[PDB]
From a paper:
By employing the symmetry mismatch reconstruction and the local reconstruction methods, the structures of the portal-adaptor and the terminator-tail region of extended Mu were resolved to resolutions of 3.4 Å and 3.5 Å, respectively. The Mu connector complex, which attaches the tail to the icosahedral head, is comprised of three proteins: the portal protein gp29, the adaptor protein gp36, and the tail terminator protein gp37. The connector complex in the majority of myophages and siphophages contains the portal, adaptor (the first head-tail joining protein), stopper (the second head-tail joining protein), and tail terminator protein, but Mu is the rarely reported myophage to possess only the first head-tail joining protein. The Mu portal is constituted of 12 copies of the protein gp29. Each gp29 protein contains four distinct domains: a crown domain, a wing domain, a stem domain, and a clip domain. It is noteworthy that the final 124 residues of the C-terminus in gp29 are absent in our structure, which verifies that its C-terminus may undergo proteolytic cleavage by protease I during head assembly. The Mu adaptor is constituted by 12 copies of the protein gp36, each of which comprises an α-helix domain and an elongated C-arm. The adaptor gp36 exhibits structural similarities to that observed in siphophages and myophages, with their α-helix domains adopting substantial structural similarity, but their C-arms and β-hairpins exhibiting conformational differences, possibly due to the differences in their structural environment. Despite lacking the stopper, the adaptor of Mu, which may assume the stopper function, serves as a docking platform by binding to the tail terminator protein to join the head and tail and prevents the release of the genome.
Myophage Mu is a representative of contractile nanomachines with a simple tail baseplate.
Author numbering:
A (entry chain T): 221 to 293
B (entry chain U): 3 to 304, 322 to 388
C (entry chain V): 148 to 220
D (entry chain V): 294 to 304, 322 to 388
E (entry chain T): 75 to 147
The structure:
Amino acid sequence: RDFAEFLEIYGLPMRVGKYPTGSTNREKATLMQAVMDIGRRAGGIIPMGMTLDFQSAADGQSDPFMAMIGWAE
Amino acid sequence: RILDISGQPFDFDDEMQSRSDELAMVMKRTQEHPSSGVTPNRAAQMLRDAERGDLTAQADLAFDMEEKDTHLFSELSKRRLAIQALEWRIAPARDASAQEKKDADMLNEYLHDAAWFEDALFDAGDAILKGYSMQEIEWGWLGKMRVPVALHHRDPALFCANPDNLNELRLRDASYHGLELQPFGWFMHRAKSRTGYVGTNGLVRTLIWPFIFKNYSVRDFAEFLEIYGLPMRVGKYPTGSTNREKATLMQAVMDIGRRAGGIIPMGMTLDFQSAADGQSDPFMAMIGWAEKAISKAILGGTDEVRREIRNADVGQLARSINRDLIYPLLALNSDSTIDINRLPGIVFDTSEAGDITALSDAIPKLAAG
Amino acid sequence: RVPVALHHRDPALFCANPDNLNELRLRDASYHGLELQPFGWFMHRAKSRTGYVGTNGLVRTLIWPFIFKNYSV
Amino acid sequence: KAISKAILGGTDEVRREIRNADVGQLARSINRDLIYPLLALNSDSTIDINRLPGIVFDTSEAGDITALSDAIPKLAAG
Amino acid sequence: FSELSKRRLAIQALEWRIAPARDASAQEKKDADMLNEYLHDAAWFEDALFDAGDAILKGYSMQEIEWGWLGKM
């Protein structure tokens, strides 16, 4: 079950967006929608004040889970 | 009045129980698909409900699994073709009389001459995955003999177990107690893979989890493959850019492919960031583990065990046939009471094929004595 | 009386009777299709899986691997 | 490999079983659809329902003539 | 479950026969063979044996008995 949970959140880094403190409430909504619209071969234009980065939320291999499963079996 | 196998007299009606006008409403059903968005809590709730006597959601889930999963369908088809390939013959009881032998051979000839027998056996094989298999009986006349014209398969979702007494199926009629099965009008075959009450002896209980894991892993793998090996293209523009200038940059970013060129001003920047990374090893490892688990569950190995499985389920099917189809034919055809302990049965050709090369050793034994 | 020849027909021109499944009918833009003319058709069905007609074919299990393979390639 | 497993059963005995099953189904379909109408139209009298001919396919494994030489001792013994 | 099913199918595949005690009399042999014939003629024996195999995983197996009459027996 832990292996399945790890596989669920694997190989898809989280997309974050940084906005200046002077941004309007509506401007945050547009950025949030734009972050949610990333897939396949995606483009996009970002202002100089804003930044976009990808951070992986899970890393590792399947060797230990499979080793334990095989030992138990 | 026709005497039941248990010895309780009853009245025989040729019309089907499902042909009643009041029962016609429940016969038409919409086959829901509970395999869309499966959740472990949802599966546990479905199994718990099926334990108490629901038997509907579990049946629909099993139907969805037998078509959505390729490996499970392949293994079930292999098992059903293995059981179907055997040969059968009707034999009477030991120390049978001449009349008993005549009845046995006439029934045997009729059943080889009956076309619906093969379809009935194939449909009765559905109790390997589902906990039960229910088929109608359409009685008719053939030379003043009461024989079934044809047998019609029925949806397993239309039956519920009696809460007062489990292990007994009943026809659902939107009531606390379902309608009792009409005697001499049904062919009920159940495969007891695991001991316990009906609705828990099927292969769904153990095969629900590997199916979920394998399907979720493969769908996540496909989604990851969709957004793989193509980094996102971004463009940075100065805060003083015109509205039209942003549109041109956005169009230029969208026009990148093959061996692309382009000129960019000093104030603008262009970069590539990968939106997905990793390998396919863990997804394939999980998929392989689930597939071999399913194969072990269905076939027993990933052979002798296959032979034992065939012998067991063939014996169960033979017992079901003897209890459901053999007795009513003799009871309806014969005017006198049918002896309970002296009726013919069905025996399948469950014998290993000999090797003619190694049986040449019998000649010295025959010479010796 | 012998058949001169047999002509294959498009499977898309037939519909199952809603009142009674497992029975095919010729589509005629009506709630109930025309019943098959006796001694005029040759209907062969392969029951790979038990159930009603139109669900016993190999399409039901082969639809998904085809989609995955084609999209991947 | 999933498609191959679905269609053929393996990626042989299983192929033989598949052939036997679908050949039997096709034979039943032929007997129900084509054999009966020919006799019904050609013959003036009513056609017996339980006494009509059928079609049987040659579903028999080919024997090995080398290993059947063992029948001679059995024939001699009786 | 697979291992338990394999073990239960292995134990179930054996063949059984009722035999009397050593140096048995004619009446003892007759009783033994009549019981043997009855138990092969009894349908519930196979189900009883299969249910008694549940004591491999569980510590015990309990089954009811419904007594009846068959030819004043």
